């Protein structure tokens, strides 16, 4: 059972969301839920929404009994970057990379 | 007639990368840097194809010296005795015999001593 | 080095800090409860509690000083009228701080500071 769930084009950066993902990597659904709820990060809620989507998918589109479910594979990946021009001193122009990341959560009973 | 060289360039780059596969860092990822490794690797292989003979000769000489000194004779004296006895055996087989069968090496040493004296 | 010194700065000058403490104490004693960051409540205890300590007693000069502090006629009227007798039997610890998590805007330690009252 895969029961995959992802949130593409997320505003949060992959480098900053991998830190939150590692905390819940390989932990039980309830433990991950509470850790994300009480984590002091925007990425915490960003990935808690994905975890809720995944568990709802498991409940409805797949087998019930979410109690014996574990987050087996979770990984954060970068997404398309938007180019923005920010004026600087001496007339110099630099480019600001509005980075977006793809987050995928896979939950399986075994 | 415009000719696109992308396929040929990619083929050559893949050949170089597969030759350089297994290296550390960018040496196995960047073609521009991996190309230096394969040339240096080839030079090292060319040097080692000659260095291996002399290194194995060194190791065999060390083993024969050890065995001869254990038996009670020096390597130079043992070789001189073999030459005087007209024995064409080489260091590789001598070292194999010394490592595996002690009685054979004892026979070699005693015959060499008899020839010398 | 700050060896044994007391008094937070709160990234504010003396005038701004004293005005902030005055306003916060006035609001706290007016509403019997407020929400503020934990350091703010910790530093506001040392300001609010002496207000109640002073209000314990009643006199013309005491009223004038209680007005000079907190600069609010309505607040001083509430003091000496309801804040006095309701704590005449309590010696210290007139305020209670309950941590309530972190603010969403900037993730600052939030805590509710209130009097030990409201048992209606």
């Amino acid at each position: 059972m895969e029961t995959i769930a992802k949130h593409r084009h997320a505003r949060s950066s992959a480098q900053k969301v991998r830190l939150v993902a590692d905390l819940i990597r390989g932990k039980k659904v309830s433990q991950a839920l509470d850790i994300l709820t009480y984590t002091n990060k925007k990425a915490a809620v960003l990935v808690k929404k994905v975890l809720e989507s995944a568990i709802a998918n498991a409940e409805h589109n797949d087998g019930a009994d979410i109690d014996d479910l574990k987050v087996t594979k979770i990984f954060v990946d970068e997404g398309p970057s938007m180019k923005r021009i920010m004026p600087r001193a001496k007339g110099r122009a630099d480019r600001i990379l509005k980075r977006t990341s793809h987050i995928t959560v896979v939950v399986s009973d075994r | 007639a415009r000719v696109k060289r992308g396929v040929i360039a990619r083929a050559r780059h893949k050949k170089i990368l597969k030759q350089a596969k297994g290296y550390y860092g960018a040496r196995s990822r960047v073609y521009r840097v991996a190309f230096q490794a394969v040339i240096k690797a080839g030079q090292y292989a060319y040097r080692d194809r000659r260095q291996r003979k002399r290194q194995f000769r060194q190791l065999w000489i060390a083993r024969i010296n050890a065995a001869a000194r254990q038996n009670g004779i020096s390597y130079s004296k043992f070789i001189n005795g073999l030459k005087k006895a007209s024995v064409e055996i080489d260091r590789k087989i001598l070292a194999d015999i010394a490592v595996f069968d002690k009685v054979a090496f004892t026979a070699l040493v005693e015959k060499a001593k008899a020839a010398l004296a | 080095m700050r060896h044994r010194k007391s008094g937070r700065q709160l990234n504010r000058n003396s005038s701004h800090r004293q005005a902030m403490f005055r306003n916060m104490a006035g609001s706290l004693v007016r509403h019997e409860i407020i929400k503020t960051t934990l350091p703010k409540a910790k530093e506001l205890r040392r300001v609010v509690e002496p207000l109640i300590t002073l209000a314990k007693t009643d006199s013309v000069a005491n009223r004038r000083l209680a007005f000079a502090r907190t600069r609010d006629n309505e607040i001083v009227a509430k003091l000496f009228n309801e804040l006095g007798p309701r704590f005449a039997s309590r010696a210290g610890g007139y305020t209670r701080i309950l941590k309530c998590g972190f603010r969403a805007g900037d993730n600052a330690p939030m805590a509710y500071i209130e009097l030990v009252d409201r048992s209606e």
């Binding site: 830190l19 939150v20 590692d22 905390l23 984590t39 | 860092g25 960018a26 | 941590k99 998590g101 509710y112």
Partner: protein, 56 residues
């Protein structure tokens, strides 16, 4: 005030190794409401040490 050569991903990962957070691992269950909350913090509903503290 500038790098002579580009550092490698190995050194980058070694530096970032210490940037990982640590889970609270201190979820406390209320005696009365039986709700999870941060230690020495009031619950979301407003219950702390069994008795209510927020009245809202």
């Amino acid at each position: 005030a500038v790098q002579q050569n580009k550092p490698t991903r190995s050194k980058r990962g070694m530096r970032r190794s210490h940037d990982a957070l640590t889970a609270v691992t201190s979820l406390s269950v209320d005696k009365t409401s039986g709700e999870k909350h941060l230690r020495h913090h009031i619950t979301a509903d407003g219950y702390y040490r069994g008795r209510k503290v927020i009245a809202k």
